Amino acid sequence: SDQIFNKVGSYWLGQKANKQFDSVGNDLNSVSTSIEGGTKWLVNKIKGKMQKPLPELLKEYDLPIGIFPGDATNYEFDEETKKLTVLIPSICEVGYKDSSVLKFTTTVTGHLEKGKLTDVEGIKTKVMIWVKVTSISTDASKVYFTAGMKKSRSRDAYGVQRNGLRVDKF
């Protein structure tokens, strides 16, 4: 004797959805460098000309001090800097009871103007206070040493009158 009935229902549903966000990246690139090659002389002719009549002109755009050796007083300027740079052959530190001691660096920068070179960057000068911007005011003729009349030196003898030796030349 049977009348058994067990119906089981089955439902179906399918949730379909999709959200996939990703992000695209990017990177930066910047490579740069530089060298120096202003001095160029494959010939070694021992005289302040090298191979071109240039060095006279540099000192010519500069003041009549010529510093002393003729090696220094080079007239150059940088591009990015736009500050003029005078090349001194070697770093000379000159000290005497004059004041104390003065440091003349090689590649010094400053505001060069026809007549006077104002505000340097490399020449630490102590005449009374130690300052690295004490500059050389010249009247395109007479010179007033780096400080501004604080040290009285006559252009007459060799331009700038102090006993220093830029240790690059003998």
Side-chain angles (χ1 to χ4, degrees), residues 58 62-63 65-67 71-78 83-89 105-112 117 120-121 123:
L58 294 63
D62 190 91
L63 331 177
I65 73 296
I67 295 180
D71 299 280
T73 297
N74 295 210
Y75 181 100
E76 283 288 87
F77 58 92
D78 311 284
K83 186 69 66 60
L84 180 154
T85 184
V86 177
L87 297 67
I88 294 67
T105 302
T106 45
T107 309
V108 76
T109 45
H111 177 254
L112 182 292
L117 173 62
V120 284
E121 184 58 68
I123 296 169

Side-chain angles (χ1 to χ4, degrees), residues 35-95:
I35 57 179
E36 187 176 288
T39 51
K40 180 175 60 179
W41 47 278
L42 65 172
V43 299
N44 53 89
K45 185 64 178 180
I46 178 179
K47 194 63 180 178
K49 304 177 183 179
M50 298 67 180
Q51 60 180 31
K52 294 296 181 179
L54 310 179
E56 301 303 285
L57 304 181
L58 294 63
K59 51 180 66 175
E60 164 168 284
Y61 296 108
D62 190 91
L63 331 177
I65 73 296
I67 295 180
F68 189 89
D71 299 280
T73 297
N74 295 210
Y75 181 100
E76 283 288 87
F77 58 92
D78 311 284
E79 287 176 88
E80 59 181 88
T81 310
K82 296 182 179 64
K83 186 69 66 60
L84 180 154
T85 184
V86 177
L87 297 67
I88 294 67
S90 180
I91 184 288
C92 177
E93 296 176 80
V94 55

Side-chain angles (χ1 to χ4, degrees), residues 2 4 11 17 31 41 52 56 58 90-91 98 105 120 128-130 154 157 165 169:
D2 61 87
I4 177 178
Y11 297 102
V31 294
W41 47 278
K52 294 296 181 179
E56 301 303 285
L58 294 63
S90 180
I91 184 288
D98 175 274
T105 302
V120 284
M128 182 181 180
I129 300 71
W130 68 104
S154 306
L165 62 171
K169 185 182 67 181

